[PDB]
Design a protein around this ligand. Structure first.
Ligand code: R1Q
Ligand code: R1Q
Ligand code: GSH
Length: 1333
C-alpha cells in the first residue's frame, strides 16, 4: 500500500497485496461477526420451514460450487506466497458458512435475507475492485477469480427474489429491498390517490402486532414480576426491550453515517483546493457522499420503523392489560381511581409511552452526536469551538426554561378552554330557552370573556413560541459566528478556508437537532415516569376473589355465616348473614335505607370483599343493577347483550317489560342508538332495558337490585305480573329482588327482611305478618384536496397585512441567510499574504450584520405568524359564535350537538395552537429547499438539468402521500375515540359484565377496537417512512449531483463555492420530505378553518333589532294578541288559525299529542317563520319587529326550566339590567325568599350544570321568578308536587297580564276562561269553559 498507484495516479489501482488481503477479509469477516448474532433472530423469531423450491436449491448448489472453486485455489497453491494459502481457505470457509446460512434460513422460514443480500453486495463490490485490477493487469489463478465473480453475481441476483411462503399486511411477504426502501405500501398510496381509503381497505394487522399477541405476553411478564414480590419498567423492557435493541444499533449506524457527510465534504473541499489532484478522486468522494447519505437514510428509517412498531406494541399491550385489570380489580381500587383517571391510563399514559418510544433513543444518541460533532469541530478549529459550546450551553437551558413556561401556559389554556367548552355545552343544551328568552348576547359575552382569558394565555404562549423559533433558527448562526470570530481573532495565522468554514457549518447543522430534542426527551422521560407510576399503581391493584362464590353449575343460593366488606380496613356491611333460597323461588330483600339490601346482591356477585363465610350460588346469574348500565349500541343489542337473536323470545321480552311504548316514541324503534352519546333515555326506560337484557339472557338465578325504582306504579305492577311474578316470564327462575314497595310483597315466596346488614327473621309474608316482629315493624314504618379558498380565508382572518408582512419577513430572513453564506464563501476565498488574510474584520463585521438581520427578521416573522394566529383564532371564534347564536332553533335540532361542540373544541385548538406552527414549519421546510436549490443552481448552473426529473419524482410521491395520508390520518382519528369510549362503558358496567360473565366478549371487543386503531395507525407511520425514503434519497440524489457538478467544473469553481453548494445540498436532503409532510399537515389542518366558517352562509334568523320599525316601550300596552290566519310548517302543523285574545284575558290551549299547542307558542316568539300568518300584538305586526324586541317583551315558562351554571342572579338577570331590589321583590313573590336567603352566597349561589344541586321544584320557581322579574304583559306557560305553588303564583299577580297556557292537565286549564281547543291545528272550539260544557 503506497500512494503512488492507489491515489496519486490517474488510474486508481489497488495494490496486489491489498487486493488479496483486505478485499477478501471484508466480506468473509462480515458474515463471521453477523453469523453468531443472526442465530438469536433466527431462533427467537420462527415462521415454519419453506418447501423445497428450485430457487432455494439453486442458491445452495451455487454455494457448494463457490466453496469448491475457492478451495480449488488452495489446491493449485498446494501444487509460495503466504497469502495464497490463508485467503482461499478463509474464503471457502466463510462460503461454507454462507450456504449453511441459506439452509438454516430455509429451515427457519425467512423469504428475504438482509444479511445474505448485504453480504453478497459487499462481496460483489470487493470482487469488482479486484476484477477491474485483474482486467487492467492483462489464466492460472485469474480464471478462478472470474468464475468466483460470476457465481457471486448470480448468487446476488438470486438473493433478491423472495422465496415461497411457509387482506394481509404485505410487510411480511416483502423482500429485503422492499422492506428497507418501503415499497409494499406503494400500492396503498396509489390506491389512496385513485380511490378513497376506508377501514375495509386497511390491511390486517401483523400477527405480532395484534392485541391477542402482545397483551398476553405483557400480562404474563407482569404476573411473573408480581409473583416475585414490583417494577413495571422491568416488565416493559423485558417484553419490548429485545425488539428495541435493533433500534439502538440502527441509531448508532445512522449517527456514524451522518458524521461521515462533513468528512467527505472536507475531502471534496481539499480536492477542489489542489488542481493537480486526479478527477477520479473527486468522483470517488461524491460517490462516497451519495452512498453514505443513502445508507444513513435507509438505517434511519429502519430505526424509525422499529421505534414506531415498538411504540405500537407497547400501547396495545398497555391498553389490553389496563382493560383486563379493570375487569378484575376490586371495588376499593375502582373507588380509589374514579373513572376518568382509568380512561386516562388507557389514553394519555399509553400514548405517552408510544410517543416516548419514538425518541427515547435520543437520550444517548443526542449526547453521542454532540460529543462526536464537538470533537470534529475541535479537529477543525482548535479551542475556538469553546465559544460555540458556550453559546449552546446558554441556549439549551433557555430552550428548556421556555418549554417549561409554555407547558404552564398550555395548562392554563386547557383550563380556560375546558371552562369555555362547559359553557358552550350548556348553551347548546338549552339553546331553545336562550333564544326564547333573548339571552344570546349575554351568553355570547360570557363565552367571549372566557375566550379572552384563553387568548391572553395564548398570546403569552405565542411570545414564547416566537422566541423559541428565533433561538432554534438562529442558534446555528450564533455558534458559527462565535467560533469563527474567536478563531480569526485569537491568532492572525488562523486562516478561515472553506474546509474550516463549511465543514464546521455542516457540523453545527448536525448539532442543531440533538440539542433541541434533548430537553424535550428528558421532559418526555419525566412525564413517562409519572405515567409509569400511575400504570404500575393500577396494575398492582388488589384483584377480586373469583372463587369468593362457589359458582356451582346445575339450595339455589346458599349463604352460611357470611360477613362481607366493601374494603379490608372498612367494617363489615353484612354481618353474619345466613339464608337458603331454593330453586325457582321469589325472594324479596326488605329493609330501610342503608340497611344492606344492595350489598347482599353485590356479595352474591363477588363484588363485596368476603371476610368470612360460604356462598354457593348455583348456575348463571343475571344482574339488574340499581344504576342502569346502557351500552351505546342500539337498544336491540342492549337487550340481546351479544346473544343470538330469537324473534319470538325477544318479542316476548320487550312487551313484558312494557317497552313497547318506549319503542314507539323512540325514532328508529329498537334500532335507536340509546346511551349517553345517542338518544337519552329516562331512568325508568333505562331500568326497563336493563331488566329486558337480564330476562333475555335467560339465567337461572336473577339478582334484581330494585328494578322497579324508576318505573311508575302501573308500569311496575305490569312488569312484575309479566316478568318477575310467579305467572310471568321467570316462573322457574330463582329471583332475588331488592324492594322497598309493599304492593308485591304478599306474592313473594320468601321475604328476607334485614336491619343494619344483619339477617332479621326471614320468612314468608303470611308467617312474618303472623309473627308480628321485624316485618310488622317494617310495614308500620310506612375528501379531495382542500381548496385554496380556505387558505385565503385563514390569511384574511390573520389579516392580509400581517400575513404579507410575515411572508416578506420570511423572504428577508432567507435572503439574509443565503447572502450570509455567500459572504462566508467569499471570505473563505480570501487570499493569504504574509500568513494572514487582509480582509477579516470587514468580512466578520458583514457576517455578523447579516446574522443580526437574520435573527431580527426570524423574530419578526415568528412574531407576525404567532400574533396573526391569535387574531385569526379570535376572529374565527367570534364568527362561529355569532353564526351559531344567529342560526334558528331548527338548525340546532337538525345538526347533532356533537359536531357543534367539535367546532368550539378541537377545531379552535387546531386553528390557534396548531395551524400557526405548521405554517412556520412549512415556510421553513419550503424556503430551506428553495434557498438550497438557488445556491446549487447559482454555483453550478448545469445542476438545472436534474431539477425537472427529480422534481417530477417529488410531484408524484407528494401526490400519493398527500392523497393517502389524510385518509389514513382521518381513519386513525376515527379509531382512537371508540377504544376509550368502550373502556368507559366497561368501567361503568363492570358489575353487569362480571355478573353476566361477558368478560371475554368485552375483552375481545376491546382487542378489536385497538386492532382497528393500530390498523389505521400502522399504514400512516409506514407512509411517513415511504415518503421519507423516496424524497430523502431524491434530496440525496441532488447532493450527488451538486457534488458531481462541483467536481466537473472545479477548475472554474472556488473551494468556498463548492463547500457552500455541498453544505446546502446536505440539508435540502433533510427537508424535501419535511416540505411534503408540512404540506400534508397544512391540508389536514386548514380543514379546521373550513369547518369553522361553514355556518357562515347558512340561513340565519330574522334580524334581532330592526331599528327602522322598532316598537315603542310598552309595545304590548294591554297585550291584545290576534292570530290572523296563522299557518306554521314544522305539512302544516298549524293551519287556519283566526283567534283573538283580548288584553289581560286569561286564555289556555288544550289539545292532544300531535296538535299545534306548543307550536302556537313558537308562533308568538317567531321561533319558526310564519308560512302564512299575520300575528299582530295590539296594533303592531310580529314579523316586522326584530326578534330580540318581541322576545324581550314576551315571556315564556317552558316545560323544563333550564338553569345555567353561575350565580342565581345571572340566571334571573344575565344582563344585570334589573336592580337588586327588583330581583329581591320578584324572588319573594315567587315563594323563594326563604330558600334564596338560606344560601351562604346570598344571590351569588353557584348552581351547577342544569341546577343539579337545586331541586326540580326550585328550578321551576326560579324560572317563574325570571318571568316575574321580566314584568311583561304577555306570558306563556307550558305545564307538564309544587304545581299548587306555581299555579297559585301564576294566579296571584299576573292577572293584569295576558297569559296563554298549554297544559296536559285539564284541572288547571278549567280555571282559565276562553279555552282554545286544537284537534289537528284547527280551532275545534273557541269560547269559555262554561260554553265548553
Ligand atoms: C412549539 C415548539 C415546538 O414544540 C417545537 C418543534 C415543532 N413543534 C411542532 C411539533 C413538531 C415537531 N416536529 C414535528 C413534525 C411534524 C409535525 C409536528 C412536529 C418538533 C418535534 O420533533 O417534536 C417532537 C420539532 C421540530 C423541528 C425540530 C425539532 C423538533 O423537535 C426537537 N427542528 C429543530 O431542531 C426543526 C428541524 O428542521 C430540524 O431539526 O432541523 C435541524 C426539523 O427537521 C428535521 C430534519 O428534524 C423539522 C421537523 C418538522 C422540519 C422542518 C422544519 N421544522 C422547524 C422546526 C423543526 C422542523 C417540535 C413546535
Ligand atoms: C399523525 C397526526 C399528527 O401528526 C399528530 C399530532 C398533531 N399533528 C399536527 C402536528 C403537531 C403536533 N404538535 C403540534 C404543535 C404545533 C403545530 C403542529 C403540531 C403533534 C406533535 O407534536 O407531533 C410531534 C401532536 C399534537 C397533539 C398531541 C400530540 C402530538 O404529538 C405528540 N396531543 C397530545 O399530546 C394533543 C394535545 O392537545 C394534548 O396534549 O392533548 C391531550 C397537545 O397539547 C399538549 C399540551 O401537548 C396539542 C399540542 C399543540 C395542543 C393543542 C391541541 N392539539 C391536539 C393534538 C395535540 C395538540 C402531532 C398531526
Ligand atoms: N438527524 C436526526 C433525524 C431525526 C429526524 O428526522 N427528526 C425528527 C422529525 S422532527 C424525526 O425523528 N422524525 C420522525 C418522523 O418521521 O415522524 C437524528 O439524529 O435522528
Amino acid at each position: 500500500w503506497e500512494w503512488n498507484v492507489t491515489w496519486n495516479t490517474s488510474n486508481p489501482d489497488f495494490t496486489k497485496c491489498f487486493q488479496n488481503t483486505v478485499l477478501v477479509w471484508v466480506p468473509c469477516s462480515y458474515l463471521w461477526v453477523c453469523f453468531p448474532f443472526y442465530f438469536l433472530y433466527l431462533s427467537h423469531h420462527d415462521r415454519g420451514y419453506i418447501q423445497m423450491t428450485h430457487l432455494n436449491k439453486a442458491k445452495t448448489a451455487l454455494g457448494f460450487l463457490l466453496w469448491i472453486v475457492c478451495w480449488a485455489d488452495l489446491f493449485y497453491s498446494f501444487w509460495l506466497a503466504p497469502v495464497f494459502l490463508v485467503s482461499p481457505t478463509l474464503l471457502g470457509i466463510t462460503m461454507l458458512l454462507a450456504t449453511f446460512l441459506i439452509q438454516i434460513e430455509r429451515r427457519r422460514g425467512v423469504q428475504s435475507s438482509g444479511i445474505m443480500l448485504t453480504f453478497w453486495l459487499i462481496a460483489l463490490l470487493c470482487a469488482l475492485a479486484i476484477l477491474r485490477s485483474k482486467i487492467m493487469t492483462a489464466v492460472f489463478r485469474d480464471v478462478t477469480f472470474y468464475i468466483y465473480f460470476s457465481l457471486v453475481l448470480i448468487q446476488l441476483v438470486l438473493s433478491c427474489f423472495s422465496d415461497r411462503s411457509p387482506n394481509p399486511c404485505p410487510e411480511s411477504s416483502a423482500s429485503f429491498l422492499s422492506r428497507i426502501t418501503f415499497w409494499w405500501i406503494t400500492g396503498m398510496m396509489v390506491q389512496g390517490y385513485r380511490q378513497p381509503l376506508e377501514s375495509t381497505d386497511l390491511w390486517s394487522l401483523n400477527k405480532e402486532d395484534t392485541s391477542e399477541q402482545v397483551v398476553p405476553v405483557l400480562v404474563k411478564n407482569w404476573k411473573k414480576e408480581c409473583a416475585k414480590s414490583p417494577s413495571l419498567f422491568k416488565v416493559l423492557y423485558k417484553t419490548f426491550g429485545p425488539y428495541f435493541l435493533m433500534s439502538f444499533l440502527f441509531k448508532a449506524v445512522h449517527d456514524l453515517m451522518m458524521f461521515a457527510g462533513p468528512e467527505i465534504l472536507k475531502l471534496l473541499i481539499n480536492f477542489v483546493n489542489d488542481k493537480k489532484a486526479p478527477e477520479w478522486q473527486g468522483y470517488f468522494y461524491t460517490a462516497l457522499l451519495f452512498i453514505s447519505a443513502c445508507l444513513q437514510t435507509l438505517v434511519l428509517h429502519q430505526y424509525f420503523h422499529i421505534c414506531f412498531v415498538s411504540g405500537m406494541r407497547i400501547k396495545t399491550a398497555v391498553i389490553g392489560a389496563v382493560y383486563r385489570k379493570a375487569l378484575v380489580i376490586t371495588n376499593a381500587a375502582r373507588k380509589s381511581s374514579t373513572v376518568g383517571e382509568i380512561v386516562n391510563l388507557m389514553s394519555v399514559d399509553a400514548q405517552r409511552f408510544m410517543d416516548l418510544a419514538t425518541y427515547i433513543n435520543m437520550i444517548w444518541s443526542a449526547p453521542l452526536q454532540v460529543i462526536l460533532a464537538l470533537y470534529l469541530l475541535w479537529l477543525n478549529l482548535g479551542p475556538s469551538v469553546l465559544a460555540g459550546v458556550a453559546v449552546m450551553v446558554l441556549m439549551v437551558p433557555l430552550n428548556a426554561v421556555m418549554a417549561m413556561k409554555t407547558k404552564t401556559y398550555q395548562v392554563a389554556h386547557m383550563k380556560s378552554k375546558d371552562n369555555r367548552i362547559k359553557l358552550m355545552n350548556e348553551i347548546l343544551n338549552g339553546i331553545k330557552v336562550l333564544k326564547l328568552y333573548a339571552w344570546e348576547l349575554a351568553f355570547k359575552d360570557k363565552v367571549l370573556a372566557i375566550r379572552q382569558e384563553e387568548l391572553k394565555v395564548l398570546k403569552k404562549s405565542a411570545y414564547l413560541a416566537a422566541v423559541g423559533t428565533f433561538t432554534w433558527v438562529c442558534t446555528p448562526f450564533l455558534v458559527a459566528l462565535s467560533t469563527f470570530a474567536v478563531y480569526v481573532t485569537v491568532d492572525e495565522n488562523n486562516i478561515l478556508d472553506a474546509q474550516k468554514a463549511f465543514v464546521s457549518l455542516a457540523l453545527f447543522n448536525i448539532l442543531r437537532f440533538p440539542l433541541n430534542i434533548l430537553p424535550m426527551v428528558i421532559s418526555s422521560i419525566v412525564q413517562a415516569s409519572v405515567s409509569l407510576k400511575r400504570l404500575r399503581v393500577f396494575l398492582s391493584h388488589e384483584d377480586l376473589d373469583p372463587d369468593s362464590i362457589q359458582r356451582r353449575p346445575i339450595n339455589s343460593i346458599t349463604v352460611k355465616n357470611a360477613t362481607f366488606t366493601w374494603a379490608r380496613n372498612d367494617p363489615p356491611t353484612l354481618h353474619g348473614i345466613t339464608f337458603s333460597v331454593p330453586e325457582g323461588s321469589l325472594v324479596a330483600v326488605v329493609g330501610q335505607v342503608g340497611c344492606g339490601k344492595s350489598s347482599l346482591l353485590s356479595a352474591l356477585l363477588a363484588e363485596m370483599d368476603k371476610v368470612e363465610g360460604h356462598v354457593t350460588v348455583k348456575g348463571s346469574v343475571a344482574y339488574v343493577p340499581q344504576q342502569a348500565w346502557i351500552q351505546n349500541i342500539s337498544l336491540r343489542e342492549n337487550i340481546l347483550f351479544g346473544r343470538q337473536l330469537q324473534e319470538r323470545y325477544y318479542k316476548a321480552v320487550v312487551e313484558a317489560c312494557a317497552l313497547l311504548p318506549d319503542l314507539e316514541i323512540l325514532p328508529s324503534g329498537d334500532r335507536t342508538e340509546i346511551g349517553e352519546k345517542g338518544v337519552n333515555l329516562s331512568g325508568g326506560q333505562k331500568q326497563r332495558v336493563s331488566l329486558a337484557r337480564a330476562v333475555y339472557c335467560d339465567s337461572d338465578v336473577y339478582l334484581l337490585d330494585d328494578p322497579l325504582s324508576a318505573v311508575d306504579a302501573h308500569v311496575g305492577k305490569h312488569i312484575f305480573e309479566n316478568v318477575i311474578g310467579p305467572k310471568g316470564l321467570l316462573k322457574n327462575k330463582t329471583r332475588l329482588l331488592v324492594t322497598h314497595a309493599i304492593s308485591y310483597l304478599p306474592q313473594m315466596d320468601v321475604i328476607i327482611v334485614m336491619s343494619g346488614g344483619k339477617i332479621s327473621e326471614m320468612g314468608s309474608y303470611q308467617e312474618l305478618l303472623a309473627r308480628d316482629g321485624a316485618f310488622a315493624e317494617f310495614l308500620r314504618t310506612y375528501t379531495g384536496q382542500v381548496k385554496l379558498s380556505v387558505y385565503w380565508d385563514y390569511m384574511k382572518a390573520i389579516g392580509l397585512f400581517i400575513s404579507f408582512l410575515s411572508i416578506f419577513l420570511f423572504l428577508c430572513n432567507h435572503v439574509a441567510s443565503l447572502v450570509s453564506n455567500y459572504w462566508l464563501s467569499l471570505w473563505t476565498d480570501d487570499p493569504i499574504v504574509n500568513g494572514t488574510q487582509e480582509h477579516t474584520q470587514v468580512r466578520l463585521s458583514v457576517y455578523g450584520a447579516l446574522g443580526i438581520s437574520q435573527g431580527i427578521t426570524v423574530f419578526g416573522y415568528s412574531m407576525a405568524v404567532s400574533i396573526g394566529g391569535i387574531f385569526a383564532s379570535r376572529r374565527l371564534h367570534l364568527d362561529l359564535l355569532h353564526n351559531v347564536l344567529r342560526s334558528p332553533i331548527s338548525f340546532f335540532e337538525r345538526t347533532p350537538s356533537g359536531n357543534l361542540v367539535n367546532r368550539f373544541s378541537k377545531e379552535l385548538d387546531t386553528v390557534d395552537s396548531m395551524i400557526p406552527q405548521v405554517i412556520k414549519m412549512f415556510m421553513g421546510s419550503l424556503f430551506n429547499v428553495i434557498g438550497a436549490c438557488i445556491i446549487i443552481l447559482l454555483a453550478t448552473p448545469m445542476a438545472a438539468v436534474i431539477i425537472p426529473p427529480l422534481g417530477l419524482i417529488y410531484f408524484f410521491v407528494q401526490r400519493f402521500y398527500v392523497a393517502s395520508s389524510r385518509q389514513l390520518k382521518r381513519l386513525e382519528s376515527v379509531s382512537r375515540s371508540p377504544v376509550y369510549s368502550h373502556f368507559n362503558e366497561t368501567l361503568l358496567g363492570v358489575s353487569v359484565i362480571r355478573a353476566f360473565e361477558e368478560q371475554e366478549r368485552f375483552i375481545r371487543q376491546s382487542d378489536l377496537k385497538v386492532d382497528e386503531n393500530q390498523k389505521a395507525y400502522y399504514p400512516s407511520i409506514v407512509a411517513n417512512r415511504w415518503l421519507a425514503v423516496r424524497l430523502e434519497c431524491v434530496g440525496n440524489c441532488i447532493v450527488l449531483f451538486a457534488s458531481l457538478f462541483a467536481v466537473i467544473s472545479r477548475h472554474s469553481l472556488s473551494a468556498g463555492l463548492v463547500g457552500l453548494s455541498v453544505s446546502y445540498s446536505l440539508q435540502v436532503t433533510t427537508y424535501l420530505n419535511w416540505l411534503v409532510r408540512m404540506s400534508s399537515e397544512m391540508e389536514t389542518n386548514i380543514v379546521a378553518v373550513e369547518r369553522l366558517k361553514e355556518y357562515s352562509e347558512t340561513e340565519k334568523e330574522a334580524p334581532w333589532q330592526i331599528q327602522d320599525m322598532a316598537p315603542p316601550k310598552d309595545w304590548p300596552q294591554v297585550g291584545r294578541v290576534e292570530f290572523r290566519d296563522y299557518g306554521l310548517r314544522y305539512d302544516l302543523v298549524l293551519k287556519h288559525i283566526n283567534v283573538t285574545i283580548d288584553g289581560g284575558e286569561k286564555v289556555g290551549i288544550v289539545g292532544r299529542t300531535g296538535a299545534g299547542k306548543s307550536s302556537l307558542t313558537l308562533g308568538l316568539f317567531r321561533i319558526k317563520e310564519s308560512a302564512e300568518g299575520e300575528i299582530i300584538i295590539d296594533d303592531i305586526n310580529i314579523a316586522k319587529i326584530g326578534l330580540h324586541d318581541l322576545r324581550f317583551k314576551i315571556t315564556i315558562i317552558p316545560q323544563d326550566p333550564v338553569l345555567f351554571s353561575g350565580s342565581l342572579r345571572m340566571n334571573l338577570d344575565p344582563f344585570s339590567q334589573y336592580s337588586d331590589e327588583e330581583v329581591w321583590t320578584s324572588l319573594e313573590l315567587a315563594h323563594l325568599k326563604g330558600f334564596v336567603s338560606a344560601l351562604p352566597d346570598k344571590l351569588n349561589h353557584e348552581c351547577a350544570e342544569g341546577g343539579e344541586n337545586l331541586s326540580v321544584g326550585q328550578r321551576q320557581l326560579v324560572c317563574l321568578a325570571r318571568a316575574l322579574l321580566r314584568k311583561t304583559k304577555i306570558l306563556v306557560l307550558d305545564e307538564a308536587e309544587t304545581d299548587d305553588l306555581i299555579q297559585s303564583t301564576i294566579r296571584t299577580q299576573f292577572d293584569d297580564c295576558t297569559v296563554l297556557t298549554i297544559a296536559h292537565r285539564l284541572n288547571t286549564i278549567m280555571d282559565y276562561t276562553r279555552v282554545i281547543v286544537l284537534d289537528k291545528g284547527e280551532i275545534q272550539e273557541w269560547g269559555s269553559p262554561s260554553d265548553l260544557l
